[model samples]
Target: NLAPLPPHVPEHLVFDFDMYNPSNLSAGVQEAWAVLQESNVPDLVWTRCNGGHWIATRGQLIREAYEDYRHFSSECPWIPREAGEAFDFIPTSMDPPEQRQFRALANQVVGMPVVDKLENRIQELACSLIESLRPQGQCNFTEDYAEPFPIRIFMLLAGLPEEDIPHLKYLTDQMTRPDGSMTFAEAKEALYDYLIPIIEQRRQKPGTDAISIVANGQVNGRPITSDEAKRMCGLLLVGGLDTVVNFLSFSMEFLAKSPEHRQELIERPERIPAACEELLRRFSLVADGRILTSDYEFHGVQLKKGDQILLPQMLSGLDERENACPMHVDFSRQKVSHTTFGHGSHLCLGQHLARREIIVTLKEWLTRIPDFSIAPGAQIQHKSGIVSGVQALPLVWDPATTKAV
Candidate 1:
């Protein structure tokens, strides 16, 4: 006799893409998922890989899955057993009610009002970073600009010392892209260990910085505990550090290859805002999954309780079914929509800050180095997993073309 499986599931529906560290990611991420798209697969299907889970291929289904947290739990959200087991962070890990409180606190730091206050600082930093590198004519965009730009801004907002970034960034990277140096559990412990003292110090003497505010703030009508503060802080660190860093690299790579796209942005500076949205849709660098809360059937596929589902938050809007010639970058495309920042109650709180950073870069960078590309013949590599990224982007431009302002 055959073992039990979810109801109404077809045998051939199962596909194993091995999305975890997929090989040939250097070519482009969409190519890997294209395998499923070309096969005429359903929006939802099962895959017996990484401990087996459901996968959503289209935008509408994926958006529904993210919004309906009732059936899909964000708690312990991640593919592969190791990531799920090690996953523990306030707000992102916690479902509604409990999650909303911490999210409100996070908003105090990186929200629209705060971003407005920091606008001058953000613009100054972007200009200074790009000006320093423009003279070189060749620099790894990831390390030089992408990584440091957002991180330093985060550090400034948190009132942390700039010197601590190298170490903190390493730990944050391990959380999503495990380098085998430490397991997720070990990394979480280490982060908590560091945050403990910081929170204690802040509590002793509260200040205007984000850490101090969160450390001393109340949640659910009670003082936030050090442990709770640590988890929330960890989430902020990861969000401010990795997301924009990878996005910058990907945007730069695409701009480098597509000069026509770059020229359009250069000619029409007001279009940077729309272009940012388009890039966010096209790249969709982050892939977040959800776990099923109970056994249920949707779109003719029965999902078992406790079973995980891999929803490519990145893949949906890029689906050709949703947009004509979806793969191509068109700034003029009407009704651009995507869950790149996230969706529903769990939508990214720091998105305003993220948009500000990207918009600032695009507006200012074009003025300084209007033309640049991947160093001739140098390989541009891409990686996969929870967060996808370009390993390196060696950018080059003519110094003579750049005018020192």
Candidate 2:
């Protein structure tokens, strides 16, 4: 159901696109969103979907809005006013200097230093997991490897029970891509329910875990309250379980289909790092928006206070104006541009760890399972939402060709 268009938004700007389920989804998730960049579409359009919100279709507007946070508040980052109102994750929900401090503490847990310290374990897990799947001949890449590799590492880092992934992943998935079975508020409540007790226990007896670090970490000269820790830890859980998990599947699916691309990486393993950047550009996902702070005229459009605008981070690099032949993946592209890890103050704190996971997976998987393809009769499917993901990735290969590490 499209919401009634607001008076400030002219009828010409209306483009009723449902973010959760795009009209051209069959084409591909990124392709579906690229519809906004066609010749007829304006730089900024008002979408009646998701409770009537503004959409910045071009990279210029997206970067401008993210940089000018004063005009665009992070308090209501989610679209559909209800979900935005209910989103209360720390640092993400806050902005500027205030968000910076918490982000610093957040960085303490998943930052470059942490990744560097855990390097051996990260590499070990990747090899161990891939080697076990090697002799299988064929496997559901999403379930068998993609999910477990990074998710397990994150669970180990957070010191959360690995068995809890099912419940936690379910709640996290609902918040981004609801099946209509539960409201965003309901999902948020359930996740908080799980984190509340853990946050409380970790505060009393701090340990060397992600949750315990944030629970006892100082914020602005004061001890973080239990409630604040729960909110922040909640963000960590969702980020840990969702982002990289979905991303790996997308990258792998692309590799399975593009033999030439796979061969390029296999021949020059050193290019894996550069290839990682290019893949991030082509397969970039994750789109969230910010709410307008007050009456403001942005690039000739009048936006009112409380108006929400989706500045899709995924669309930035995909913009033809940003990169030539935007859809094609070119590792040699001198400048690999994207907001995949986001931009501005809320830039992803876990990027270091994410890159490591992506890099490791590419290097290790290619070494063992050098050649693989989509399972026979299987048509790969992609899901669209706040975080676009592959629903399932069934991959087939010859076990005889694989090497055991």
Instruction: Work out the TM-score per prediction.
Output: 0.95, 0.99
Best by TM-score: 2
Residue 182 shift from truth in candidate 1, angstroms: 2.2
Per-residue C-alpha lDDT of model 2 across residues 252-364, encoded as one tens digit per residue:
99999899988998899999999999989999998998999999999999999999999999999999999999999998998988999988999999889999999999999
* TM-score, cand. 2: 0.99
* Root-mean-square deviation of candidate 1: 2.5
Let me know the TM-score candidate 1 reaches against the reference structure: 0.95
Worst 10 residues of 1 by lDDT: 1-10
Top candidate (lDDT): 2
List residue ranges in candidate 1 displaced over 4 A: 1-10
The collision pairs in model 2 are none
Worst 10 residues of 2 by lDDT: 219-228
- Each model's C-alpha lDDT? 0.83, 0.92
